[PDB]
Design a protein around this ligand. Structure first.
Ligand SMILES: Nc1ncnc2c1ncn2[C@@H]1O[C@@H]2COP(=O)(O)O[C@H]2[C@H]1O
Ligand SMILES: Nc1ncnc2c1ncn2[C@@H]1O[C@@H]2COP(=O)(O)O[C@H]2[C@H]1O
Ligand SMILES: Nc1ncnc2c1ncn2[C@@H]1O[C@@H]2COP(=O)(O)O[C@H]2[C@H]1O
Lengths: 200, 200
């Protein structure tokens, strides 16, 4: 996009190494981010430090938007780099000037906000309506369709730890192990540690 | 002013109480704005049980999620709680108003942001809390809303056990049992016609 190139001209770009934290929950929000390269996880936590992953976000995604529309808000979640990342940043105040000049850039942001609300509402449904087995089976399916899934004789090979699965579906590493064993017994997957083949 | 200008481009209509304004799966081509009344946003499981994702009220946009990409479906049901007066405008015409004054899109997007914050908090509650914890957090959330009333013992709220159940994802009977327990632990009063949540 000329429109994205223009926007990015007004930003300053910074590099975050894998596993660094871009955004901490509770911080005062005054800036917008945009992922030029790399991927992140958006995380929230329990009273006990238990993590739940709300979303992954990737190249092309805005981050830090939820504070833009009313002053004095706090970041709603943690954002942690899943890989090395390159991230453009701009102040809300400069971004609002860009909006005035060309509201197409707010349309692009708002389109992502709408999709997130859809996807997060679908997550609420999954958590409310599906048992942990159904959530795990749905998670493996979705991971198998991701761009990073390797093709396999029997289906798609994915790379994900039980910990990560637990953080997505909302259960312990141990509950994940018990259910993965069930799914292999049922001849639906194979599991070799962090490697899982989902059968087509 | 801005609002007054926007409503002049809309058609306004009345929906009686209990009438469904938006059905999940319908083609999304139009945006709505609540001039008067209150609605619930609902999803359904495979057994017809409804969960309430949100209550929305006068000044809220509804049906916004399809605005940014063509050929989408309505993501949820939206049902009138009270009778509603609702302004409606095509997505095409709204996209024209945005070029006049993108504050109208800022207002809509502020609401999407809030909704994503609320719905993300719901994801955590379902992941991290048991049904009692979820009910307790729901009472706390209701106590914080502007329509709660100050009470000598805390905040007084107005909500049926059926509504709580649809918010939390449990039966009305389960709610009634758990409220009696919470009252017994001296956290709420619920034996009256409303609920008072202590220390609120
Ligand atoms: N449910 C969600 N889906 C996708 N991204 C989210 C979600 N919740 C929060 N975030 C992102 O996490 C960021 C945390 O900081 P902000 O609240 O400023 O902006 C937030 C969003 O960019
Ligand atoms: N309800 C839950 N019970 C246990 N772990 C949870 C829950 N929700 C999210 N999690 C997270 O998922 C993680 C899976 O790996 P761990 O068991 O090490 O730690 C777990 C928590 O951080
Ligand atoms: N989690 C949510 N919170 C508040 N409103 C929502 C939520 N999910 C869906 N909606 C509203 O429900 C409407 C359903 O139709 P749309 O998807 O067009 O637009 C949607 C929003 O206005």
């Amino acid at each position: 996009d000329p429109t994205l190139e223009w926007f990015l001209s007004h930003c300053h770009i910074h590099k975050y190494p894998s596993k660094s934290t871009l955004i901490h929950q509770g911080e005062k929000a005054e800036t917008l981010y945009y992922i030029v390269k790399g991927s992140v996880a958006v995380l929230i936590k329990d009273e006990e430090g238990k993590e739940m992953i709300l979303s992954y976000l990737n190249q092309g995604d805005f981050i830090g938007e939820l504070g833009l529309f009313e002053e004095g808000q706090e970041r709603s979640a943690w954002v942690r780099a899943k890989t090395a990342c390159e991230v453009a940043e701009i102040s809300y105040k400069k971004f609002r000037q860009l909006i005035q000049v060309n509201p197409d850039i707010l349309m692009r942001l708002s389109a992502q906000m709408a999709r997130r609300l859809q996807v997060t509402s679908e997550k609420v449904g999954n958590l409310a309506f599906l048992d942990v087995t159904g959530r795990i089976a749905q998670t493996l399916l979705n991971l198998a369709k991701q761009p990073d899934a390797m093709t396999h004789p029997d289906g798609m090979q994915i790379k994900i730890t039980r910990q990560e699965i637990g953080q997505i579906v909302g259960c312990s590493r141990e509950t994940v192990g018990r259910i993965l064993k069930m799914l292999e017994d049922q001849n639906l997957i194979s599991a070799h540690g962090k490697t899982i083949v989902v059968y087509g």
